[PDB]
Design a protein around this ligand. Structure first.
Ligand code: ADP
Ligand code: ALF
Ligand code: MG
Lengths: 50, 579, 394, 453, 452
């Protein structure tokens, strides 16, 4: 029962903390990179007009 | 005779007309004050002058005069143990003339002291066929470095009259009978900073360098003539490596160049260098160090010059046959100076705004270094080792500065913030860092001490690589189900990290590790993990062998502390770990 | 009588030419003395900007440029069956033999169809019949499998004045129509732009299930006559194996295989394996009822961009004969790589992951032209176009 | 003569273009006489042909073009320096705001300042006792040092700055600190609180201050910090004083330069900020240190609020590459009532090695210090494991550490904004936190220092 | 001759009063001091033409300088005597040997191969590497690149493949065309020293473009090599092996040219026409119908930040048949060559391996050792998550297989040529550890033939 409980909380943390923290992390990472390159090419069009 | 008139002033960018006689890359005296500048581009009779001084108070209508020559430096006696700005002007003499502790504007001073008297000892005799690079004599500028005066490039003839005496750098010491006519040679020669000094042939650097740092000299080595980059975030240890490398390099000369950094760094470097006495020589580290300083608050365009100035001084010394190590701290500020100019030139910016030719100028810089056969009949062997520090924003090595750098350098000393905050020093990321010289240095080191060093280094890297594999699969899962065998590797990697890689420069002992010490400590930790493997394969539990080896495992901790004479202390740990 | 313009400026793949008032936007042009592949992009006053899709080395100002006077179009008539083309309909089987070389030389222009070959026209309509766009006047047994039915081209309204059977080339008039705009002659060759689709009477719901012969498809995941199916193609999954069984066993009239952009050695596969398929009902090669599009990755970007737009125009042409046509796209992920390249050359605002913002509308333009439709004409025959496209994500 | 033109070309936002001019220098202070009598100062940003583009500090609000004039002064923006500045309140441009007598200037210095010769520089190894154990022991502050305090929106960054200037002194000496403060776009409530603390301390009279609040025009914020560093070095090297510099908020300063950077249509860099931000911040931070032969010194304690609490933001990132270390305030430590909420793991001081040791503070400071961080890092690493995998799952050795980091945050770091603990009481406290771990786990303290303490 | 210099902005300069100028046309600057510098046309207008000088514009006086237009682009003086000779990025001699009389002058651009004229690559190539010849087989006429990284030993592997490349029983020697693009002088010397010391230079033609050379010099370097490789294979009937490194420096040279023309980049700061640019070079290969010769291209590129979604390896994977991927984890453990076979694939390996090709057991042992590694690698990780107690008697063999396959199969050495016979037999020895019940992909007809 003690080893069952160690594994149980091991499993629980992964589903409720580690994996969700990553899933939300990946969302924010990919979000930033796209708008950054989206806004980066935007000024390059403005600089091309100079 | 032409007097240019300014038509535009936009920061350090000044445009002036009536320049049709001048050429590109020519030095100029801009404005009524006469600040130093340089032509970067030319449209019709208007020239865009990159000004190397502050442009406050300068408007259109002020005169501007060219010099006819590009940015050059005075290569002759009086450069050793002296510090100069980005244009190689002596900052100590700058203090004495203006009589002020603050930097001024519109003043030009020669680099070397042309009134100083030196003892030129003539080595060559009259009637010898000479060419560019041949040595006609020398002047002992310091105790160790024998400053040999050589024939400048473009002079090929026969020596007619030469003799020893006490002359200045300007005084003619020899008369060469060339086809053009009789030419008088001086101890000083000028050379353009944006033009590299030529050679006879480019050799391949396979003689490694003893830096004194354990993580450097074992896993990520740099050979005499290599190019190492040290990227990392702020507070990670980029400048500590440059200082400690210079203090404990076996090279014949050190060229420390401060580029866009903090002025307080230059102070302690100039003070500590004469104190670091070499016991085998009696002289100090200052007598082979040439300093170039252009701080962050100084004009931005001067950061370009400081980079090309130090690499030029290193080439004047590598032509003599002496190993030189040039320190570029930091390259990032130079890269910043380009982008800020490229924005004022309306040029097309690359990633993060950097100019597209950044990778070209970086490749043009590091390709000057390396093992080279200097020009001359003696075929003397010279070498320049480049140790650069990169400062990417937020520790992001995906910036173009670091990415273009790693495409031309061979050694990468990546600094990690997570280790620097944990007071791990030098904070070099073992998994992330690498060295293209690790294969050839392993072959050399295997021969010098006659031990299989290349494969026992591979075993240490494998242990550190296995930990990263374990640690990443074990961060989230946890180590409770770690097998007894796997747990030993964790305690092997912990010993490798805190005992060998973790070293502090401030403690006199950990600052330098000799080749005999780096082996003994490795021999203790590696034979431990190899013979304690045999202990765990004797049906032993994990908990035990550690508990009964805390006394051995502590002598392993202070293994760096053993003095060079008392090394037997380190090698004696191999038998007690077995017992 | 096209107005020849003179190049004034050449930069990268972009070429500027003036004296171009006669040309229309998005027309094709032969740029320079060499006559490379160039498409008009923008025009200001008499100066037109032209994106050049071939190499621009050796061309400069002063060299003339000839506009074709039309957008990217296709020759539609006898000869098109069992002949291989590229994205812009350049006959490779003709390039091979005529030029005596194995390369596609810059500026080498060859007509799409065979304008010299004789075809026996079998006149099925007689004189005096009121005709409109779509009505079949006669067919030519172009190939052993298919009966190429010649149709009245669009924009022609009148009475059949004189018709006669016999043997003609695709440039010879086979009929005369007394239109409202005067007497006009009709040939077996008709041109149509690949950008705009062929008009129809009424589009219908694809409710006719197709018999592909594969049990996993016809039972659980069936495609209808006029539907659309997207297929990922990871390496080793037998993507070409499933493709050959569909192009061979499906109850369709013509197969229009389209190579958008493919690896050279991967394309050679299709050039050798696709003719090796035998048609099950007669025993001849599958080429008899197929029109193959061949584009490697080093083809001009216009060929890779309009690769699927070319075949669907050929499919719509055969669809209007009442035939059921299956078009195959492999791979569409490389086709979008052509549109992604266009968005960069044209300096446009980027969409998601570099692809242009009009990617969803461009795919909408393609898959909305396929389906079970009622072709124009008095017969009101039902044609079908079924799209089987392949995707290959990164 | 009086150089004043009345041929305005265009007015766009904070920028302005005058044509048909001559003799206009770069970085030249100007004045704008409008059609109603108002005067607004400005500086020249670009001079080409007969044209001059200038930036108006107070903004161009209600300016008629045909009936206005531009008065060029022929000199850069200057500050009237004098010793009568002590205990005075000036605005963000330099005009006195405390309703007092006008200062009789002993000199007029360019606000841009001057670069100190590195050979003329003196390396700062002096020790400053700030009364805070997280600074005095962990990230030591020295006289003449560039040590900023990184904070965020709402964090008690204003409470920590008053605590330091209240308790700062040097060992074996009685010298006082001439504090120089500069408000940059902050709210009135922050400035008033700082004023009330300075009054309470009794050092208000010593301090010289420049005030730019939030309701003030943002364009002039570009010159306000240059006002202070010109007056700071004036009192240090020329008057022979030990000057301390504290500025907030530096975040609003960078925002002000981006407004002009955006108005000038320049080539942007990271997040629209100008590419020369590392250089522009360097013109301010490198105005600090000691000069050989002069009894003065300039110490800087900048304060900035990290946008989105992100250290990789260009403002706190470039600051770290210029300044010697930093002091980071985290919202997590302030969340737990830790006063001051100093996160000493990412913080660092780079001038301290020469400022500690025997004769300066304590012989064993360096060994304890090094031993502290390493054990705190692992104790915090273990606590972050206890809350995830459970208390019992943690190793017993690590569990002793888990309590090590708990007491090292509530007792060691948490000391209050009014506690001046001595350096002897700070280092003795540190050993008491190391006596928990067994002697075998203290590997970065030698036996000689372990035995004596 | 023109002495009309209007604008000079960095290494770029504009010359007015021009006519009949073409794009990428070679120019020649005559300076005021008599110095001669060359250039290429990056842009032409009716009244002016911009050119980039190779040596740069340092010290050039616009008023007293002159520029000569040659009227032809970068052409290669092709000849059969090029074998054994080493040039630079512009075809200039580098070894200081005898001069070569050109048989023809061909522009370096080349021509597009007709896709129906292209022939199927059928012949196997023995690279001497077990990880390649067995699991990612190269075929004569295939585009198979090598995805490496900054710091990975791609130079040692480039010197090994060209040294150990041979065709079975053909009785005709393989031709090697090596092209160093923007590499360092040290890496360039490593290649040149290895080809001369082993006698492979007697079979090779090397083009050497350094890193400090102009960006316009890096762009022509692959066009120089492929034009000569096109001539050796298609005009003479030779079998040619083309090797190029580093390919990334070629893309950066396009960026310096693209920004010089003020072109807005595309994805990730690269020019929009890159897909056409890379495919133009990568598709100048393969066997041709009616011709006995063949071109085999093996590009080598280092991925920025080891990213596969980067435009350089993303577009290369769309053009080339397969990819050979090296990993930093395998190199830091001592595996040489560090070639990971799991992400590596060969899109033409099916024709290369079989009876008559190599041996009947080539396809079966490939698929068997492929699944045995993925199962052995997951078993070793299961010993890290669940401990060694959860591993059964079969799992202990799978974990032992992967460990040996990493250290004994792939880890062979950068100077170890293994024949196809020695490669397959080693795979059987590593597969002999697992019981027969484990080996399911291999039929028992051939399993009872080679299994020891
Ligand atoms: N090898 C080292 N040994 C001990 N401390 C170090 C080492 N490297 C860095 N540090 C610590 O980090 C601080 C900053 O190092 P420095 O090299 O100046 O950072 P940067 O990366 O900004 O150059 C130093 O003051 C020192 O306390
Ligand atoms: F503080 Al640094 F490089 F010196 F980030
Ligand atoms: Mg530093």
């Amino acid at each position: 029962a003690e080893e069952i409980e160690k594994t149980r909380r091991r499993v629980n943390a992964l589903e409720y903390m580690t994996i969700p923290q990553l899933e939300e992390t990946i969302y924010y990472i990919k979000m930033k990179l796209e708008e950054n390159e989206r806004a980066e090419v935007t000024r390059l069009i403005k600089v091309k007009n100079m | 005779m032409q007097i240019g008139k300014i038509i535009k002033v936009s920061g350090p960018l000044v445009m002036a007309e009536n320049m049709s006689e001048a050429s590109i890359q020519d030095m100029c005296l801009v404005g009524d004050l006469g600040v130093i500048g340089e032509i970067i581009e030319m449209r019709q009779d208007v020239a865009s002058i990159q000004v190397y001084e502050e442009t406050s108070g300068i408007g259109p209508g002020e005169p501007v005069r060219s010099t006819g020559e590009a940015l050059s430096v005075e290569l002759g006696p009086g450069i050793i143990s002296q510090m100069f700005d980005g244009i190689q002007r002596p900052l100590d003499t700058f203090m004495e003339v203006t009589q002020s502790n603050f930097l001024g504007r519109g003043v030009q001073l020669p680099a070397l002291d042309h009134e100083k008297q030196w003892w030129f000892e003539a080595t060559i005799e009259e009637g010898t066929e000479v060419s560019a690079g041949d040595i006609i004599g020398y002047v002992d500028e310091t105790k160790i470095i024998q400053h040999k005066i050589m024939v400048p490039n473009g002079i090929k003839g026969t020596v007619q009259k030469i003799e020893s005496g006490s002359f200045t750098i300007d005084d003619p010491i020899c008369v060469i009978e060339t086809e053009q006519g009789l030419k008088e040679l001086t101890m000083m020669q000028k050379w353009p900073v944006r033009r590299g000094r030529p050679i006879k042939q480019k050799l391949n650097p396979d003689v490694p360098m003893i830096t004194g740092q354990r993580v450097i000299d074992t896993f990520f080595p740099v050979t005499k003539g290599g190019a190492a980059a040290v990227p990392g975030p702020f507070g990670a240890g980029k400048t500590v490596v440059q200082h400690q490398i210079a203090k404990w390099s076996d090279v014949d000369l050190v060229v420390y160049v401060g580029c866009g950094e903090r002025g307080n760094e230059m102070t302690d470097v100039v003070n500590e260098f004469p104190e670091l006495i070499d016991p085998n020589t009696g002289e100090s580290l200052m007598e082979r160090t040439v300093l170039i300083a252009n701080t962050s608050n100084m004009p931005v365009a001067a950061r370009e010059a400081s980079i090309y100035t130090g690499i030029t001084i290193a080439e004047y010394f590598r032509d003599m046959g002496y190993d030189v190590a040039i320190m570029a701290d930091s390259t990032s500020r130079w890269a910043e100076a380009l982008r800020e100019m490229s924005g004022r030139l309306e040029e097309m910016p690359g990633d993060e705004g950097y100019p597209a030719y950044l990778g070209s100028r970086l490749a043009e810089y590091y390709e000057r270094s390396g093992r080279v056969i200097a020009l001359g009949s003696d075929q003397r062997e010279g070498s320049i080792t480049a140790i650069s520090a990169v400062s990417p924003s937020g520790g992001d090595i995906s910036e173009p500065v670091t990415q273009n750098t790693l495409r031309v350098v061979k050694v990468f000393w990546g600094l990690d913030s997570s280790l620097a905050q944990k007071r791990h020093f030098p904070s070099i990321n073992w998994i992330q860092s690498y060295s293209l010289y690790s294969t050839e240095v392993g072959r050399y080191m295997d021969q010098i001490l006659q031990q299989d060093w290349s494969d026992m280094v591979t075993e240490g890297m494998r242990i550190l690589q296995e930990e990263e594999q374990l640690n990443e699969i074990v961060r989230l899962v946890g180590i409770d189900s770690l097998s007894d065998n796997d747990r030993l590797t964790l305690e092997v990697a912990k010993s490798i990290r805190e005992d060998y890689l973790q070293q502090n420069a401030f403690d006199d002992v950990d600052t330098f590790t000799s080749r005999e010490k780096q082996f003994n400590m490795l021999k203790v930790i590696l034979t431990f993990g190899k013979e304690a493997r045999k202990a765990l394969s004797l049906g032993a539990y994990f908990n035990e062998i550690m508990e009964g080896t805390v006394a051995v495992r502590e002598r392993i901790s202070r293994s760096k502390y053993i003095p060079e004479e008392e090394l037997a202390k380190i090698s004696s740990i191999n038998e007690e770990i077995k017992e | 009588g096209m107005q020849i313009g003179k190049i004034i400026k050449v930069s990268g793949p972009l070429v500027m030419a003036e004296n171009m008032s006669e040309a229309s936007i998005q027309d094709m042009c032969l740029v320079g003395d060499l006559g490379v592949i160039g498409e008009i992009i923008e025009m200001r006053q008499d100066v037109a900007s032209i994106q050049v899709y071939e190499e621009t080395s050796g061309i400069g100002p002063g060299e003339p440029v000839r506009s074709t006077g039309e957008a990217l179009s296709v020759e539609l008539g006898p000869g098109i069956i069992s002949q291989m083309f590229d994205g812009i309909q350049r006959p490779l089987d003709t390039f091979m033999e005529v030029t005596q070389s194995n390369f596609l030389g810059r500026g080498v222009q060859l007509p799409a169809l065979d304008h010299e070959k004789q075809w026996w026209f079998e006149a099925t309509i007689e004189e005096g019949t009121e005709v409109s766009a779509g009505d079949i006047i006669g067919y030519v047994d172009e190939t052993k499998i298919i009966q190429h039915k010649i149709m009245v081209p669009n924009g022609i309204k009148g009475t059949v004045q004189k018709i006669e059977s016999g043997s003609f080339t695709i440039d010879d008039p086979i009929c005369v129509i007394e239109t409202e705009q005067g007497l006009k002659e009709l040939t077996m060759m008709q041109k149509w732009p690949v950008r705009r689709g062929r008009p129809i009477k009424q589009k219908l719901n694809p409710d006719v299930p197709m018999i592909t012969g594969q049990r996993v498809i016809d039972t659980f995941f069936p495609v209808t006559k006029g539907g659309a199916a997207a297929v990922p193609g990871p390496f080793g999954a037998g993507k070409t194996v499933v493709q050959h069984q569909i192009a061979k066993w499906s109850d369709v009239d013509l197969v229009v295989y389209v190579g958008c952009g493919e690896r050279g050695n991967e394309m050679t596969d299709v050039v050798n394996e696709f003719p090796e398929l035998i048609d099950p009902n007669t025993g001849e090669s599958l080429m008899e009822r197929t029109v193959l599009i061949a584009n490697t990755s080093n083809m001009p970007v216009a060929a890779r961009e309009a690769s699927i737009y070319t075949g669907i125009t050929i499919a719509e042409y055969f669809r209007d004969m009442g035939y059921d046509v299956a078009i195959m796209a492999d791979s569409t992920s490389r086709w979008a790589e052509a549109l992604r390249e266009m968005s960069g050359r044209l300096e446009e605002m980027p969409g998601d992951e570099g692809y242009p913002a009009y990617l969803g509308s461009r795919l909408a333009e393609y898959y909305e032209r396929s389906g079970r439709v009622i072709a124009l004409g008095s017969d009101q025959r039902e044609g079908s176009i079924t799209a089987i496209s392949a995707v290959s994500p990164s | 003569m009086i150089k004043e033109y009345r041929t305005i070309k265009e007015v766009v936002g904070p920028l302005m273009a005058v044509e048909k001019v001559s003799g206009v220098k770069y970085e030249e202070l100007i004045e704008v006489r409008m059609q109603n009598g108002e005067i607004r100062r400005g500086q020249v940003l670009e001079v080409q042909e007969d044209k001059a583009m200038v930036q108006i500090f107070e903004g161009t609000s209600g300016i008629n073009l045909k009936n206005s004039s531009v008065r060029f002064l022929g000199h850069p923006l200057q500050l009237g320096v004098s010793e009568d500045m002590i205990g005075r309140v000036f605005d963000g441009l330099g005009r006195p705001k405390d309703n007092g007598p006008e200062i009789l200037p002993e000199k007029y210095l360019d606000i841009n300042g001057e670069v100190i010769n590195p050979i003329a520089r003196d390396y700062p190894d002096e020790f400053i006792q700030t009364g805070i154990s997280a600074i005095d022991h962990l990230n030591t502050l020295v006289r003449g040092q560039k040590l900023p305090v990184f904070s965020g929106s709402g964090l008690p960054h204003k409470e920590l700055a008053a605590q330091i200037a209240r308790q700062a002194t040097v060992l074996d000496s009685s010298d006082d600190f001439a504090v120089v403060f500069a408000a940059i776009g902050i709210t009135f409530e922050e400035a008033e609180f700082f004023m009330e603390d300075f009054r309470q301390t009794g050092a208000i009279d010593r301090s010289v201050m420049f005030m730019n609040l939030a309701n003030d025009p943002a364009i002039e914020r570009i010159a306000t910090p240059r006002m202070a560093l010109t007056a700071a070095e004036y009192l240090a090297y020329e008057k022979g004083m030990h000057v301390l510099v504290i500025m907030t908020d530096m975040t609003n300063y960078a925002e002000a330069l981006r407004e002009i950077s955006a108005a000038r249509r320049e080539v942007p860099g990271r997040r629209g900020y100008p590419g020369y931000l590392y250089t522009n911040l360097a013109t301010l931070f490198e105005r600090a240190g000691r000069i050989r032969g002069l009894k003065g010194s300039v110490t800087q304690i900048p304060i900035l609020t990290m946008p989105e609490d992100d250290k990789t933001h260009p403002i706190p990132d470039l600051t770290g590459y210029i300044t010697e270390g930093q002091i980071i305030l985290t919202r997590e430590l302030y969340k737990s009532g830790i006063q001051p909420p100093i996160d000493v793991l990412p913080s660092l001081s780079r001038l301290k090695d020469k400022g500690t040791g025997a004769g300066k503070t304590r012989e064993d400071h360096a060994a304890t210090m090094n031993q502290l961080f390493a054990a705190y890092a692992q104790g915090k690493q273990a606590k972050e494991l206890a809350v995830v995998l459970g208390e019992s799952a943690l190793s017993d050795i690590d569990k002793i550490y888990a309590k090590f980091a708990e007491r090292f945050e509530n007792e060691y770091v948490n000391q209050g904004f009014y506690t001046n603990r001595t350096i002897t009481e700070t280092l003795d406290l540190g050993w008491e936190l190391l006596a928990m771990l067994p002697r075998t786990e203290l590997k970065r303290i030698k036996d000689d220092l372990l035995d004596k303490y």
